[PDB]
RNA sequence: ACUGAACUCCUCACACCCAAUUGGACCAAUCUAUCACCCUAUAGAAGAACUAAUGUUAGUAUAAGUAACAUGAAAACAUUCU
């Protein structure tokens, strides 16, 4: 199928009667879907006082420092493929959306000197903290494959990242761990990619036609 | 009568693997033309003939709407028209069934 | 020397390729829909002057790899192995069509040049041979030609049935060696640096850098064989099924030197004719 | 069951060095429990092991066997998973290295047991041109391995 | 069965008794446990008889491993990198000795069967037999039925 | 791939190859018409103990014949169609015991043997003949290879050897085929009769009486059955019968040569026991 | 033993082998296109040419009204064979169907064929054409062609 | 005269070619006692050892992809016809 209509009729049609259990236990969700506030890139000390009202002990001047150290450290996570260290580097939201697609192919990422200082340039907010930090790195990569050979980019060369990245923190345990990364509408185009595609047309039945 | 001993596999490899018993690779097949999708050589393409094969199934249908029950073969013969085309002069005197979408690029 | 003819001509054709994959942007990646009648409206997302209409063909099928001989690249009909230059729309022409004429030319003017890859090689070495160049005979006219000019040892040489018979196996041992046909289309500078001990290819080149906006000349190599197009080549020699080098007439008009022309006619793995029917075909191609 | 097959794909090689050739692909798909027998499956699948994937699909549309439209989904589905998923770039550059049929777990109906068979298709597709077939040896391989046999041999039970 | 194993030529290793003899064994590995029953006559062949054997072939290095083992084993080591490793299991200290003088004594090649009893690697002095020894010459080479 | 002649031809030159191709095998079958105004082989005269050359003739059915005395006769017609010489072979290069000549019929369409037997036909200059049988010959009786046989090679009251391959029947079982239906042999004997495929194999019916030869539509009416379908080929030859080994005085010993154009041969020569038509009916005092 | 023997053995019997293809040619008569097993495709192609030649006999004529009435086992199809297939073919003397092959049935990979009646309103077959006169060969030949026609 | 054995000699080693029967020395694996601790030791015990019972159960072969088996026809799949 490919909803949950789709099982739900079925399921009407067939007479498979599924019935809504009532259970305690509830999924105790760390994370949330999105963002809260759309950073759109080119006063929210109330955010400020509500994160500092539960935890107390947090400088802002510091954080775009811990936020070099939150983000560098777990792209270092995908260069050993260290799922372990990712769950308490990243959040949920965001590790199916930069481990999946790399599954079964090596990456080498690394960390070059950054050009700018890194500045944090939002903060919103049982309750989630979401702070948007900019970064303006230097970075290196190269994604090989199953066998091992080069499908983007040049492993020594230096590239100039912007970076508009969400972290989150629950607010008893948790942390700041990066939740997303806003790519802004106006961003050039990726680095193309060693190999060329095809993309089909409409696989056209003999009843239809091409126009 | 029964078998006097059990034949074994290097027997039967020998029998069932021989090239009497393997397909043959054949080649009469080529790629149709008109829709690309490989036919073989002395046979109509697959594709094409399920073109019209579709064709003549709506067309026998509004045929059958036409007639109305059996036993109404007409004394005349037809013509099949799609949507915007008047009946020619040579028409005149033939049935006319009327279709619902475009003249295909095939059918002349 | 022959030898060192052959060796600092493919060495300033490997300059110029060395050169013309040097200005690349690094992979830029440049998209051609597929306007053909089957198969519609597939683009192909490829390298820009790495990717030639044999690797969009390669995404295609075999079939189309196999068959496919011509492209109509924006309505200009384009090798296999020249590599594509900007977003574009491919057709891709093969010799069973509805109406194939630059196939047909594309056909002729890749076994004339064949023919050429013969001749040159075919002479010991004392006896100077000299192409001067392919006429773009119609398919109609039954045979393709190539005039050469002969040494003056040879002013009153006319070959036997086995000198045309060890020409035509000189032509199916390169057949059966499968070679591509590289292209470079280069300026007229370096076109004229390759061919520069040959008066008549020298000015042929000159003929057709006139003929175009830029100084812009194309150069076709087979293996180790440089020669001037009018247009597009055959893929590969392993096209050429049937091959014969037919006669050799000498032409009329010589004062200077015998313009001697080569005939010859072949037929592609696709267009076999029968044994009766290709010695009709050798008959005709000998006027 | 065994399932070794379907892990088969999920090997990672480390990464290459760039005075080393290019490793071709390799993509080890299967159909499980296909109900058709194993030895009707020996002919189809034996029919097309060195053949490009275009001309094993061609030479498989026009078979009239059962087992012919299986094994072109599983060609087709492995030419899929060929391009996204294993950085094959050209749909047309497979060839079939393995093609097998083992047997599948069967069932028996009681008449009098009679079996339903079931089996299995294993295919290997490998990146590249399908290599050049084995030609027949000529005389002069026969008279080199003669006279190799020739120069080998050696006064027997002796110093 | 000799068919079924495989066979090789009588050899050395690197022409052992042309200059000088050359112990092959390098390394034996003695392990030894120390509470147990079945390397009894290894620990009475380790008091009594190691240091005996190891000073009358000091071109040996032998370790004495004497690890918690359940069966006690001795690895042979030789200069052309075999490893004999055999069992010293419930053996008394004479069969022992017996033991590793036989792997002291022998060499690294392998107890498959050996085809010939000998290894000339010039067999022939006078020269091998040709169909051409002993048989005399025509005049000017003839053969049968030559005329000239 | 394998092609066909006709694959790739357009409509308009599909009937131009049939009038092209046709039009030079009707040439090339009328420039063999003069043997002898070309230069043949030295042409001897019969010796006792030598043998000629046989044809190849299509069996065009079977008629019945009257003799004067009043009996039937059931005759098959044999029409020659486009027999020629294709090779000699003397009897060192044959390393057999007698020289021999290769003879075929039945002109054939080219666009349908194997590139061999075309390069071989192209060379001798000829349309390809169906069948090529060869004739065991003395060297007296050598004709050069490319010239035609006529019917008149035989002439009546000749008893004639007739070969073909017999009508197949395909597998019969032992009651069509053999016409029937031990312990301590534990086997079965080579050459037992069993089920099998029956006919379509060469067999010869020996010493058949030539009749009467039609010389204009090249026809021999041969006594009694000759094996083999309707419009079969069969190879005709003097007959080896020792009761007949001596007749060749009168037999024209080379070949029949209407080029040589003397005493010309008239419609249809007859055994002098044949009842002609156009005879007054027979009456038999 | 069967040299000679022209009919296909069909159905279950002589009769039925003739009403199976009466059934054929009824089918072919009234949609003028029939996909059906190949044997018996050309085995009623025999019989529905043929059926024409009796369709051009007349209607008045009485033999062929006895054919008809046989042949075409709905009635009203009489009126269609002879005011309607008789008058399209009143011109040529023969080749009134054309018979192509179809892929194989997927039920019994059978040998399918379709004849149909020629000009007809249907949706014309993938015909298999020849191949174009402006191809290589073509031109070639063209132009020998040409040549032979400069002799004289 | 030569060949020719498991006889006899020769170099080293020797307890190391019979049925039923009968004497003896060892012993796989298991459990118990106490050791041992990458698989053992001394004993004590016993459902204590399988190339064979038209053995029993299960698996999978062979005969064999064999014998056998199945759907009247066209079509608009409505319907009509045999
Ligand atoms: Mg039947
Ligand atoms: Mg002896
Ligand atoms: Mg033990
Ligand atoms: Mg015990
Ligand atoms: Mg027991
Ligand atoms: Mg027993
Ligand atoms: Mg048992
Ligand atoms: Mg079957
Ligand atoms: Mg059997
Ligand atoms: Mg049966
Ligand atoms: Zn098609």
């Not at chain 1, 990456?107 to 970064?135: A, D, K």
């Amino acid at each position: 199928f490919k909803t949950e209509k789709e099982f739900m009729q079925h399921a009407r049609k067939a007479g498979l009667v599924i019935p809504p259990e009532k259970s305690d236990r509830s999924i105790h969700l760390a994370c949330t879907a999105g963002i809260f506030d759309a950073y759109v890139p080119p006063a929210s000390q109330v955010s400020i006082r509500r994160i500092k009202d539960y935890d107390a002990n947090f400088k802002i001047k510091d954080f775009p420092e811990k936020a070099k150290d939150i983000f560098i450290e777990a792209h270092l996570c995908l260069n050993n493929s260290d799922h372990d260290r990712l769950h308490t580097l990243v959040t949920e939201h965001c590790f199916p959306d930069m481990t999946w697609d790399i599954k079964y192919k090596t990456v080498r990422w690394s960390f070059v000197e950054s050009l700018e200082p890194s500045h944090v340039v939002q903060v919103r907010c049982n309750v989630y903290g979401q702070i948007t930090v900019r970064m303006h790195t230097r970075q290196t990569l190269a994604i090989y494959d199953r066998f091992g050979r080069l499908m983007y980019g040049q492993e020594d060369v230096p590239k100039d990242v912007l970076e508009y990245v969400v972290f989150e923190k629950q607010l008893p345990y948790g942390s700041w761990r990066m939740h997303t990364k806003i790519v802004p509408p106006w961003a050039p185009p990726k680095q193309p990619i060693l190999k060329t595609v095809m993309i089909p047309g409409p696989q056209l039945k003999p009843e239809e036609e091409y126009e | 009568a029964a078998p006097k001993n059990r034949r074994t596999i290097e027997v039967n490899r020998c029998r069932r693997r021989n090239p009497q018993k393997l397909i043959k690779v054949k080649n009469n097949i080529d790629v149709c033309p008109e829709c690309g999708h490989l036919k073989q050589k002395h046979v109509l393409c697959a594709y094409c003939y399920e073109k019209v094969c579709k064709e003549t199934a709506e067309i026998r249908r509004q045929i059958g709407k036409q007639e109305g029950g059996p036993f109404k073969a007409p004394t005349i013969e037809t013509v099949v028209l799609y949507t915007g085309e008047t009946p020619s002069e040579q028409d005149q005197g033939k049935r006319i069934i009327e279709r619902d979408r475009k003249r295909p690029s095939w059918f002349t | 020397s022959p030898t060192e003819l052959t060796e600092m001509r493919n060495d300033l054709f490997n300059k110029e390729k060395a050169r013309q994959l040097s200005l690349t942007p690094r992979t830029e990646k440049i998209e051609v829909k597929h306007v053909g009648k089957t198969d519609p409206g597939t683009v192909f997302v490829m390298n820009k002057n790495i990717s030639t209409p044999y690797s969009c063909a390669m995404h295609l099928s075999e079939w189309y790899c196999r068959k496919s001989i011509l492209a109509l690249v924006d309505g200009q009909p384009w090798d296999m192995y020249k590599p594509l230059t900007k977003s574009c729309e491919i057709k891709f022409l093969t010799f069973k069509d509805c109406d194939p004429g630059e196939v047909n030319k594309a056909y002729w003017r890749s076994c004339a040049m064949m023919m050429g890859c013969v001749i040159e090689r075919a002479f010991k070495d004392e006896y100077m041979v000299n192409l001067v160049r392919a006429p773009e005979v119609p398919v109609i006219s039954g045979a393709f030609c190539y005039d050469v000019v002969l040494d003056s040892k040879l002013d009153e040489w006319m070959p036997t049935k086995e000198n045309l018979r060890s020409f035509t196996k000189d032509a199916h041992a390169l057949i059966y060696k499968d070679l591509p046909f590289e292209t470079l289309e280069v300026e007229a500078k370096v076109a004229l640096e390759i061919f520069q001990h040959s008066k008549y290819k020298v000015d042929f080149i000159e003929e057709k850098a006139s003929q175009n906006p830029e100084r812009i000349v194309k150069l076709h190599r087979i293996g180790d064989f440089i020669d001037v197009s009018e247009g597009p080549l055959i893929p590969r020699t392993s096209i050429c099924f049937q091959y014969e080098v037919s006669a050799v007439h000498n032409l009329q008009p010589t004062q200077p030197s015998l313009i001697r022309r080569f005939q010859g006619v072949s037929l592609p793995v696709h267009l076999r004719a029968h044994f009766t029917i290709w010695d009709k075909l050798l008959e005709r191609s000998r006027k | 069951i065994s399932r070794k097959w379907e892990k088969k794909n999920k090997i990672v090689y480390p990464p290459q060095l760039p005075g080393e050739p290019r490793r071709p692909a390799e993509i080890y798909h299967c159909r499980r429990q296909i109900k058709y027998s194993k030895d009707k499956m020996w002919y189809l699948a034996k029919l097309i092991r060195g053949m490009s994937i275009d001309q094993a699909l061609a030479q498989l549309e026009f078979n009239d066997k059962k087992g012919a439209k299986i094994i072109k989904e599983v060609l087709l589905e492995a030419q899929d998973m060929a391009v996204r998923d294993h950085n094959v770039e050209f749909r047309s550059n497979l060839y079939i290295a393995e093609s097998t049929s083992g047997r599948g777990q069967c069932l028996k109906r009681i008449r009098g047991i009679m079996e339903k068979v079931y089996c299995h298709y294993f295919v290997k597709l490998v990146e590249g041109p399908p290599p050049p077939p084995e030609p027949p040896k000529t005389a002069v391989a026969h008279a080199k391995e003669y006279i190799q046999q020739l120069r080998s041999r050696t006064i027997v039970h002796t110093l | 069965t000799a068919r079924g194993t495989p066979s090789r030529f009588l050899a050395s290793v690197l022409h052992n008794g042309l200059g000088r003899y050359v112990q092959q064994l390098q390394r034996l590995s003695f392990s030894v446990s120390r509470d147990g029953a079945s390397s009894r006559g290894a620990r009475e062949f380790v008091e009594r008889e190691v240091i005996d054997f190891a000073r009358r072939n000091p071109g040996v290095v032998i370790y004495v491993n004497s690890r918690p083992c359940c069966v006690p084993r001795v690895v042979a080591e030789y200069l052309n990198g075999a490893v004999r490793e055999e069992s010293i299991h419930c053996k008394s200290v004479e069969e022992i000795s017996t033991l590793v003088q036989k792997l002291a004594d022998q060499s690294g090649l392998d107890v498959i069967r050996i085809r010939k009893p000998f290894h000339t690697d010039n067999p022939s002095i006078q020269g091998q037999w040709h169909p051409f020894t002993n048989k005399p010459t025509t005049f000017r080479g003839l053969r049968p039925r030559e005329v000239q | 791939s394998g092609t066909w002649w006709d694959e790739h031809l357009s409509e308009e030159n599909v009937p131009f190859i049939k009038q092209l191709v046709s039009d030079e095998d009707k040439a090339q079958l009328a420039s063999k018409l003069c043997p002898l105004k070309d230069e043949p082989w030295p042409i001897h005269p019969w010796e006792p103990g030598s043998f000629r050359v046989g044809l190849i003739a299509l069996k065009l059915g079977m008629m019945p014949l009257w003799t004067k005395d009043g009996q039937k006769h059931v005759v098959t017609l044999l029409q020659v169609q486009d027999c020629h010489v294709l090779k000699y072979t003397s009897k060192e290069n044959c390393n057999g015991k007698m020289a021999t000549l290769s003879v075929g019929g039945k002109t054939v369409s080219r666009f349908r043997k194997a590139t061999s037997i075309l390069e071989f036909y192209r060379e001798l200059g000829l349309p390809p003949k169906q069948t090529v049988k060869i004739f065991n010959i003395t060297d007296n009786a050598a004709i050069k290879p490319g010239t035609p046989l006529y019917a008149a090679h035989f002439r009546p009251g000749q008893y004639v050897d007739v070969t073909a391959k017999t009508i197949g029947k395909g597998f019969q079982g032992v009651m069509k085929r053999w016409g029937f239906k031990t312990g301590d042999i534990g086997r079965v004997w080579p050459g037992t009769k069993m089920p099998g495929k029956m006919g379509n194999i060469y067999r010869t019916e020996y010493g058949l009486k030539v009749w009467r030869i039609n010389t204009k539509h090249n026809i021999i009416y041969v006594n009694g059955s000759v094996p083999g379908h309707k419009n079969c080929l069969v190879k005709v030859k003097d007959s080896k019968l020792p009761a007949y080994k001596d007749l060749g005085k009168n037999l024209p010993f080379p070949t029949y040569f209407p080029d040589g154009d003397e005493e010309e041969l008239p419609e249809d020569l007859y055994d002098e026991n044949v009842c002609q038509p156009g005879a007054p009916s027979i009456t038999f005092a | 033993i069967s040299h000679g023997r022209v009919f296909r053995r069909m159905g279950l019997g002589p009769e039925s082998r003739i009403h199976l293809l009466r059934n054929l040619l009824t089918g072919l008569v009234r949609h003028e296109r029939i996909e059906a097993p190949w044997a018996r495709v050309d085995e009623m192609r025999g019989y529905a040419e043929k059926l024409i030649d009796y369709g051009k006999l007349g209607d008045t004529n009485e033999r062929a009204m006895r054919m008809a009435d046989f042949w075409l086992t709905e009635k009203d199809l009489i009126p269609k064979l002879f005011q309607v297939l008789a008058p399209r073919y009143k011109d040529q003397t023969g080749g009134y169907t054309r018979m192509l092959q179809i892929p194989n049935r997927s039920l019994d990979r059978a040998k399918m064929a379709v004849i149909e009646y020629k000009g007809n309103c249907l949706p014309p077959l993938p015909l298999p054409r020849r191949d174009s006169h402006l191809t290589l060969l073509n031109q070639l030949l063209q132009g020998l062609r040409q040549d032979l026609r400069q002799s004289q």
